């Protein structure tokens, strides 16, 4: 997934973690290339 706020909202990069949480994952973190890496 991405950590970008390309979609407008999600300016707070915590949005990546939330995007993962919305799939039932434990959450996620952002890589320095704006890639979002979900946990299991």
Swiss-Prot record:
Post-translational modifications reported in the UniProt record: The disulfide bonds are essential for antimicrobial activity.
Domain of life assignment: Eukaryota
Functional description taken from the UniProt entry: Shows strong antibacterial activity against numerous Gram-positive bacteria. It selectively inhibits peptidoglycan biosynthesis through complex formation with the cell wall precursor lipid II (1:1 molar ratio) thus inhibiting cell wall synthesis. Shows antibacterial activity against the Gram-positive bacteria M.luteus, E.fecalis (MIC=32 mg/L), S.aureus (MIC=16 mg/L), S.carnosus (MIC=2 mg/L), S.pneumoniae (MIC=2 mg/L) and S.pyogenes (MIC=2 mg/L) and against a number of methicillin-resistant S.aureus and glycopeptide-intermediate S.aureus isolates.
Annotated family: Belongs to the invertebrate defensin family. Type 1 subfamily.
Highest classification ranks of the organism: Eukaryota, Metazoa, Ecdysozoa, Arthropoda, Hexapoda
Protein name: Defensin Lucifensin
Subcellular compartments: Secreted; Host cell membrane
UniProt miscellaneous comment: During maggot debridement therapy which involves the controlled application of cultured sterile larvae to an infected chronic non-healing wound, one of the key factors which protects larvae against the infectious wound environment and contributes to wound healing through its antimicrobial activity.
Induction: Induced in the hemolymph by septic injury caused by dorsolateral puncturing with a needle contaminated with lipopolysaccharide (LPS) solution. Induced in the salivary glands by feeding. Induced in the fat body and the grease coupler of the salivary glands in response to oral ingestion of S.aureus and P.aeruginosa.
Residues of the full protein shown: 53 to 92 of 92
Tissue: Larval fat body, hemolymph and salivary glands (at protein level). Expressed in the salivary glands of all larval stages.
Disulfide-bonded cysteines: 3-30, 16-36, 20-38
